[PDB]
Design a protein around this nucleic acid. Structure first.
Lengths: 116, 46, 121, 212, 118
RNA sequence: GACAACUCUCUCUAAGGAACUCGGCAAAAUAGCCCCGUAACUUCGGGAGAAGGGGUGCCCCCUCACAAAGGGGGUCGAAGU
RNA sequence: UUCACAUCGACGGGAAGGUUUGGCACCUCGAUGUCGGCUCUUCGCCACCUGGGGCUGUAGUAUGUUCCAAGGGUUGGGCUG
RNA sequence: CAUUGAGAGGACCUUUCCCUAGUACGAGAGGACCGGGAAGGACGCACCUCUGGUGUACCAGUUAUCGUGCCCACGGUAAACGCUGGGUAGCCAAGUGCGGAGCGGAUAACUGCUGAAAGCAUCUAAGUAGUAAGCCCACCCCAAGAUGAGUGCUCUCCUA
RNA sequence: AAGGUCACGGCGAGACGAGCCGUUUAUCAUUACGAUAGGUGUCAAGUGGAAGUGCAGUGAUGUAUGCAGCUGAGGCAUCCUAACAGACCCACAGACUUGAAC
């Protein structure tokens, strides 16, 4: 029974679910909008918030954390060298989950992420 | 595992009706989504 | 946690060296025998000059057991070696010297066991 | 029927209470979000039996319907989410208006039986609902953990009802009896009730002296 | 003044621990240490039992912050779980510190016993 | 998408270790390279990798060919093919 | 010991059961899949054990037998399919 | 919303010790079922405080290799995670908590009480007493689809 | 209309329907009610000493900064993000008999 377990897991096995979250957050921090099924939206929400706050504190150690999580190299440098101005005193709750019509082909609930 | 005998028209009409009707209930939901999507304050449908 | 097919040590110098437990006595459970109970051990091998020879069904006690062991104060003693002490059904052992610690509570039923221990704990 | 009126609290985790004697005893911890207040009393003449209706968990008026708030209002009491009555041997001496009671009483009645909605385990199978056994896991066997047989041949001609199929396990309230009370703290209005009582911390928990 | 919050249990646990600490002072015990427990027992006419040993682990959970402790006796591996705040420990005393690079030495059980002779 | 039961492909399982069972079937367990030792029997070829036991990770050092390997010392983990 | 009936009851007789071995062969050969285990039932008693009672060649402790009693209980293994 | 409950279901099980008492009973050997007290056993309902299992959220050691330019630090990969140690919550148990009751009413076998049919007797024909884990209520969980569809304290509108 | 259902945020609830609790000026104030999920801040808890730099070492490696560091589905605090917009079902006094009281 689920009772108590609160790790949002996707349709995928462990390894591939990791990979999906890392790639998917990378591409969020790259474009700012994104379109994923709602479940992927929630699972993103957690991690991308972690990366943002990880950039709010731009010491080397943390920079190497993020350097290890995100795939694309230079989106990180742009990111932490850019955001502690954007999200100065926003203090948590960085995304926004403006949702949208389903996906012809699955009628799969589909949502559309922001950064604000 | 193998059915004995074909069902009547009676029964089958009952179940097909439950199928379609199960489709009935799931329109008025879409009609609420429509009647709300007619331009209005909302955070959905960019 | 003594099933009926375990090899115990012995904690004394009665003459046994290890011994299979058969179908414990007393508590009607018998799917599980723990400290302070009695078991029907058939000797497995012994020191070869002793009046307890190859395969002599005998009755013995459990004095150490690897499973946990609750107490009152809230401590839990757990040894590493399942061990027995050959017994008579009217009191004293028939091995005089006893090895290793035992549990003090079995005193209230096995006084002569405990008196001969080197560590009552 | 029950022996006396009872209260209803909330499960709040567990712990150990080191008895000064130096013995270790588990306890749970009962708490009251809002105090129990009588909100009715029904006689043998006006109504069919005798009982007192206590309430728990005061809440904002919105959260609660109009028939409710009218029922609560008529007796002149505060709002309250949960609401249950103890049927009591017909000796009621209670003014249905907010006789806020207390545990001046359970410390005397040092054995209490509580009624708790247990936790819910979905659609559990045979091997766990009813404590079945299972076939051999090896030796060519091909039916593990399955419910096994059902009935006999042509004569019973069907499956005797009340057969132990699988199904939903938890979710229905359960008693627990002769469960003894233990050192209580009125400043925190907490109960340190020995034993283990139905439900993960945070469900309503009727609480009433025994029916020995 | 104010009123206690809903998640009271933590506060209750803290109060009991505080009382126990006030009654007896216990130095912090860290996986590795080598303690002696002077332990009050019911009737033994001396009832200060001694329990030397290595602190295998520490299960810190409120009023059950417990130590399990391995020492070799005549030949067998005794392995006990004392609580700390138990009102029966007359006193603990931390003797040495073996400086192990780990948090819970279950390997120390089933190594060779020349390691676990207190 | 959800994450009931249950079937399969798998990982782990406290204490015992065949008690299951028609039968330890199926799992689990050994395992590589060096080094010691290797029995009953035998057609005297075999048995025999019998059995069984030990070291082996990295660093430093000089030797034996002085290409490998071995000797000495150190350091690390619970665990060194 | 005497004493038919505490207990066993020769010689013969009268029943109920339906589960053994059978007799018929009535349904079923365009098919009603066998022994033994596993899992899960549920029911019957003429009762093995627990509840109550007589009688006893019952001192007590054990019993022996019958009477009401199916609420419950009715092990783990070695050998054999 | 709170609920009575016709009906239906689960559970009321069982051993050993001690006091009674070495008493009664017995030449002694031995050695009382009248009642209490405890420990169990199987079972049943639960629960995570402790002890632990798993915990593919997680932390740490480490093998081989590829990638991040490079060293350091990391990331991927090895039928699901490479193999291992440790583990919160959850779910579990070999853990823990509790439970089988003053129960009360009819009974069966049986022992009776008064007492004729039958100017004795007989537990029975009149009438009554005791008494079984067996029956019913009690216990615990559902339950007014109980169409016999119950009950009451609140609401909701009479403008067409 | 009372009440609902849907929708929206989720759960110690759940195969799906069910259930249950939310649904923002998400108080403000003189002793309980208006934090639902996330994020954040902190604390329990776990693992166990981070990275960099320094020192000692020829080198493995150690050592200090340092119960630090990564963990933080558990506890409270925090309206930063999301419970926006809605939509729908629901009605008008509950036929017929006698009885009774004023």
């Amino acid at each position: 029974m689920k009772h108590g377990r609160k790790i949002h897991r996707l349709s995928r096995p462990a390894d591939q679910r990791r990979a999906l979250l890392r790639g998917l957050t990378t591409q969020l921090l790259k474009h700012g909008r994104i379109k994923t099924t709602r479940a992927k939206a929630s699972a993103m929400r957690k991690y991308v918030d972690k990366m943002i706050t990880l950039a709010k504190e731009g010491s080397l150690h943390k920079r190497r954390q993020a350097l290890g999580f995100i795939y694309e190299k230079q989106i990180v440098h742009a990111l932490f060298a850019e955001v502690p101005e954007r999200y100065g005193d926003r203090n948590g709750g960085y995304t926004r989950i403006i949702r949208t019509l389903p996906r012809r082909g699955d009628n799969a609930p589909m949502a559309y992420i922001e950064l604000v | 595992a193998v059915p004995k005998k074909r069902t009547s028209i009676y029964k089958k009409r009952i179940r097909k009706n439950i199928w379609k009707k199960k489709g009935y209930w799931a329109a008025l939901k879409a009609f609420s989504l429509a009647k709300s999507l007619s331009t209005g304050n909302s955070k959905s449908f960019f | 946690m003594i099933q009926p097919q375990t090899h115990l040590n012995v904690a004394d110098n009665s003459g046994a060296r290890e011994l299979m437990c058969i179908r414990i006595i007393g508590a009607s459970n018998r799917r599980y025998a723990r400290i302070g109970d009695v078991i029907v051990a058939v000797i497995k091998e012994a020191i070869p000059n002793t009046p307890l020879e190859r395969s002599e069904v005998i009755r013995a006690v459990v004095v150490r057991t690897c499973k946990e062991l609750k107490r009152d104060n809230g401590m839990i003693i757990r040894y590493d070696d399942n061990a027995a002490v050959i017994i008579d059904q009217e009191g004293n052992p028939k091995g005089t010297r006893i090895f290793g610690a035992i549990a003090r509570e079995l005193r209230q039923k096995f006084a002569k066991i405990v008196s001969l221990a080197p560590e009552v704990l | 029927v029950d022996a006396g009126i009872g209260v209803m609290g909330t499960k709040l985790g567990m712990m150990s209470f080191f008895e000064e004697d130096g013995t270790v005893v588990p306890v749970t911890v009962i708490g009251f979000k809002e105090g129990n207040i009588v909100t009715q009393v029904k006689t043998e003449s006006t109504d069919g039996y005798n009982a007192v209706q206590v309430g728990y968990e005061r809440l904002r008026d919105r959260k609660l319907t109009m028939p409710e708030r009218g029922h609560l209002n008529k007796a002149g009491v505060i709002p309250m989410r949960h609401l249950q009555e103890f049927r009591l041997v017909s000796v009621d001496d209670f003014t249905p208006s907010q006789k806020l009671l207390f545990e001046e009483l359970f410390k005397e009645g040092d054995m209490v039986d509580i009624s708790g909605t247990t936790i819910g385990k979905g659609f559990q199978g045979g091997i766990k609902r009813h404590n079945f056994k299972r076939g051999l896991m090896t030796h060519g066997s091909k039916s593990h953990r399955a419910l096994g047989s059902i009935g006999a041949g042509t004569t019973p001609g069907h499956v005797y009802k009340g057969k132990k199929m699988p199904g939903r396990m938890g979710g229905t309230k359960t008693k627990i009896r002769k469960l003894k009370i233990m050192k209580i703290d009125t400043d925190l209005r907490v109960v340190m009730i020995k034993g283990a009582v139905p439900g993960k911390p945070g469900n309503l928990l009727r609480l009433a002296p025994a029916k020995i | 003044q104010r009123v206690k919050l809903g998640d009271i249990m933590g506060i209750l646990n803290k109060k009991a621990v505080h009382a126990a600490e006030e009654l007896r002072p216990v130095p912090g015990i860290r996986t590795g240490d080598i303690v002696q427990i002077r332990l009050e027992v019911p009737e033994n006419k001396r009832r200060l039992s001694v329990y030397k040993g290595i602190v295998i682990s520490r299960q810190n959970a409120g009023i059950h912050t417990t130590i399990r402790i391995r020492r070799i006796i005549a030949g067998v591996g005794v392995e006990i779980v004392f609580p700390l705040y138990s009102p029966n420990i007359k006193e603990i005393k931390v003797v040495s510190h073996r400086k192990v690079r780990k948090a819970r030495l279950y390997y120390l059980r089933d190594k060779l016993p020349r390691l676990s002779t207190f």
